[PDB]
């Protein structure tokens, strides 16, 4: 922080807060500024520059927060050399850094901050337009935009893990360089001092490494040593220089990403965005400022997308709760595997087994009954005081016959239902490969399975509890997964609140979870009418807020009596003492064995507010989507009807004898109607955009296509008085082609109709076709300026969304791509040419 | 309320709260319950006239806490069978038990409690719940239709109370052959306030027969207080309802009550009644009455919801007026607003705009003559000295000397003075007003926020001119009710290109608590709006970054955008609103900063737009796919049109010409149906119809050509038997939509028909078209879908619903008639010949 060496592309001056006189100066500063006022201790600052520059600098030092006006434009007194001045406040002193102003780009008058921030107005918009839910897309977009703005050769999205070991997540380099994606790096490349330094100043630049750095002339009479930690000209340290030495890079630009995560707010370094170049380069301060702002935006976005993945766990927990509630109705024996929701959906796995009275059931990939007997015997004999176990890899646990099992089963999770009854879940082997570069060593994770999370064990234990209670009517788990001997622990049940009533309305079920959630003892509440006594506005144990809640509860119960499916509704009630519980009620029928309705069975689902709002938004979106789909189907039918009408009328007209030229005109109309029926037959363009398509195989000739297109277009062409000519040879005509004719006619007609529309009044258009032995090349040459550049760019498929005409162009290009061809646009003096390539069978 | 007379269809008993002995009774009880026994006298026990389980149930009910839960207690008499309901009420110092006979023709023990009783109305509640919001008349008509279907009474009416207690019939449903009173107002004296309070206390009242003889109640003389039968369901009318029934020609009555909770606990007001009248005596079981009482609660909830939605719509409208009141400071000179398209005609709802400025008169829309405007200004400057504005909806009543000569084209005038010579007029048009009572143009009166908007426009224009209070008396039949409208100018702050503050209007000073002098000449980011050492403290980093982003985007982009904003003021109050930004382009065309204003929005409205925007962001491709399809429609249509032209380009015969013209008719049909989607055409004003000459022969031929294909597919023959006299006659009206309607009607007739069936077409001229097809006929549930009874509609039924609504737009109805092997579709409409 006190290294007295600075880079030579700029100069530094350290002054006092009160005297405004130069104390610390650099050797190159005297040369650059005086290129006469001798730069030295006790010299003023105004005389080195002109009067307006001195006034601006003095006002800047007089400001409260100089960081808002950091890039200042100043002029040297002699020859008016432009310079960028940056002000920074060290304890008891002001440090100003001056850099030369190359032509480059200049903001309006003084750059300030907002104008500099304006330089990154496109990358911010592109980042804010991405659909949420995919961190990799965000990383790729940020890296690409940083590459575009900075212009450095290589851009990397180095990421920090919990053990501070790096992992590149993306990279975009110029062609002709070694990719670095996926290469892990050790924790000694970046010392913790570097991270601490980056936590303070977010952007660091090293313009060149093999350059002689000047020194400073810090005053001897100063009572404190100057700190160069905050200055942007501080010379790189040897340890940091070793990084570029091992990375064969010269110019570096490192931008920290700082997120704010709530205390378990505390700051955290999500990673870095590193830029490298093989040759030295320098960029103006506004570009660095804009890059820092863009990094702030990216940090905000990543912090937002972490919270969205924090909700998938809650959603899966709710789904498991629903499954557990559903499974409570089935009979204890064989009811575990009776219907579609078996114990495969309880925890993610590929094999399940239920040992009960020597009747081993199989549900998938699982060892033989012999091997299952052996593993059950081993678990019984070794782990006496273990109701349940979860082994990551059976080899590590110590199963003698784990070798004979093979690679099919690796992880195991077993529970003891009763003295002789047990349940097993098995997981197949997954191998992990980590490049682990910058070290390269290639570590192996041996034969291990995916870890068993907490809520999976919680669900398994809840299932065990349910089965034990059901069997009775008719707790420490050893987790040897980290090869750290026994880490036995106690899980928690995952039973949601439940209450059930008979047909009349008297309470009959009140489980301990509800007793804890409400605070009401079951003995206190049972044998009381559900509507009016347990839940009621006045004179009731649990006080509903309004009369609307009472009406809604009554409606929900009455509707649920009729319908078997469990409707999800909102619920809100006060507890015994002044607490407003807001949950999501689910009611289901209670059909008995014979099939007589006995009552209702209800359970709540406690959920955070964001999840409920997301569910509401999803419901609204699906309703809007179904309405739009119904409207589109209605329109399609109402257009299909007159389509059939005109088909039949054309058939009737063809029934009467007419001229051979009339016959040709009728045939051209027939091709037009077939094209119309085909385009109306398409369900939507989204399937075309996705890529899933089929092209029919049929015989055709070019005369039909050309005549259909000309008949389609020439009315509009003559609207602008446009001449159309055909130069295709008759030999190419006589040749017959094979493929999908309708797509070709529609695509070529659209392209050449756009050419007609772009044709100025009185222009000329020529159509030619060439057959090479087969390949067909189509040239459409129209007189005029042609399509503008932006529309030509919109024609390409790189853009996600374009104009309607641009969308038609993109769809035609995609169809040509599926037609193993290409589309080219050529501009010449007063001419524009479309070239279309196709490959078919002759 | 203390009347000792009861209706004869039930019986009454009274029990002491503690001793549980009978103290009052009725002769109907003597003739109905103990008939074949203990004497029904004072002090007689209760557990002797019923079976032991019945006595146990009665004892348990009496010992219960809240008896009003399990009211319809079915009880078996001591004699064999003879069921009876046992409704119970707790009155001061007694418990009153009413028995009503259970007729076994219906309801064989289908309800024994409140929860089971409420089940009978599940279908009605489901139908009411899923209706789209924003239409009171639809809710009322559905509600009364459901009442009619559930109860089966002859006449059902929704009777809405106004502020002056005088009622208005909003809807009504009756069996055919009955005189309607729809829309007829009634005096407030028909229903006394005592009846209103009684309805507020007892939600449902039933009078089975007005002519039935009432029976007395024998009560002990030893009690110190008389028994009150006000809460009992067995009470006799006190001649107040007898006269009402005689006047309305009714014999039986079932009258409910609608109670709505309105904010100042919130008060409860009787929004109206749902009255059922019958010409013959009728009896409904207690569960049906109990369910009809439950339906009223859902109806009241929905009515309150619709009222809140209307209030939010009003707030959105005033927000829009506030937004459009801006963009007039930017425009230079008074002529600038007149020249531009969003003119002063859009500031307030008017049919004519006039501006008098320096001997120049600028007029827009329906406006009087120049001499008329000059004489209006002369009158206003000659009779009104100190006024800054005038307002009236009837200029004739205003006292204009030549108001009658001005005609009915313009009636209401609102005028505001800008300078000593320049001033502004807003004029309205003719409105139709009819009021009925069961016992020169008037235009809608000017509201208050309209006056506020006009006053703020006056302030803006006078400020701009300088840079270069007023009485309404027509809302009532009075004179010179002076008012002082307040302005509607939103808070405004504006900065230059560097970021320093430049303009900070007083509204922002009031809202945020700061002052103009202490904030001016400071950077907008960091100094004013900042997380630290700032006047207005932002919440966290995200707000700062978002504000910077929106400022930069506003500078770069060209259109205003709305972004949520939230900050702490200097007094600790958390303000949340919407921020709108715009570029402050100079006359030359170079940006010189930004101009921003806040739109303080209500919490419900603000949160009703976040979810809307979030849902909008989900659908992107499908929104523009419709426009893409609409634009790409033209090319195949142009191709088919030009192919038709070339087909015409040679020699043709008579039949060939006819079939070509039929094809062309279908061609225009396809063109105009693909040109516009028309959405649902819910409003009759929308979907303007082309009206041109046509003949019926072409229409019929074009309609049957589209379906001959399917007819020959099933080998179904179609015959047209309309006479040549009707065919030769020419009508002036819409044709092609009639072609489509006829075509899809015969298409549906072909569907669901056996092969070899006969289809017959007839027309009578009022145009009536009858299409009779032989076979089994269309299934009933399809007709239920097409009539709108079933909310869920199939794709095939949607076309029939569209055709029915189109026929209704032609002021007609579609009729389905069923006979042995015959189904007849009758379409009726009118045109000009």
Author numbering:
A (entry chain A): 75 to 109, 120 to 348, 361 to 535, 556 to 590, 743 to 1041, 1051 to 1119
B (entry chain B): 75 to 110, 120 to 347, 360 to 534, 562 to 590, 743 to 1039, 1052 to 1119
From the paper:
Phytochromes (phys), first discovered in plants, are red and far-red photoreceptors that are also widely found in bacteria and fungi later. PhyA is distinct from other phys and is responsible for the very low fluence response (VLFR) under a broad spectrum of light and for the far-red light high irradiance response (FR-HIR). In higher plants, phys share a conserved domain structure consisting of an N-terminal photosensory module (PSM) followed by two tandem Period/ARNT/Singleminded (PAS) domains, and a C-terminal histidine kinase-related domain (HKRD). Then, we solved cryo-electron microscopy (cryo-EM) structures of apo-AtphyA, AtphyA-Pr and ZmphyA1-Pr at resolutions of 3.8 Å, 3.0 Å and 3.3 Å, respectively.
Structural comparison of apo-AtphyA and AtphyA-Pr revealed that they share a highly similar homodimeric structure. However, notable differences were found around the PΦB-binding cradle. Except for those in the GAF helix-α5, the key residues involved in PΦB binding retain similar conformations in apo and Pr states of phyA. Tyr327 of apo-phyA helix-α5 can cause obvious steric clash with the D ring of PΦB. Thus, helix-α5 of AtphyA-Pr moves outwards, to accommodate the bulk of PΦB and facilitate the formation of covalent thioether linkage between them. Similarly, in AtphyA-Pr, the PRSSF motif contacts GAF helix-α5 through hydrophobic interaction with its Phe554. Nonetheless, this contact is probably abolished in apo-AtphyA, as a closer location of GAF helix-α5 might cause substantial steric clashes with the PRSSF motif. Thus, the portion downstream of the WGG motif in the PHY tongue of apo-phyA becomes more disordered than that of phyA-Pr, facilitating the entrance of PΦB to its pocket. Size-exclusion chromatography assays demonstrated that PΦB-free phyA (apo-phyA) and Pr conformer of phyA (phyA-Pr) have a similar molecular weight of ~250 kDa.
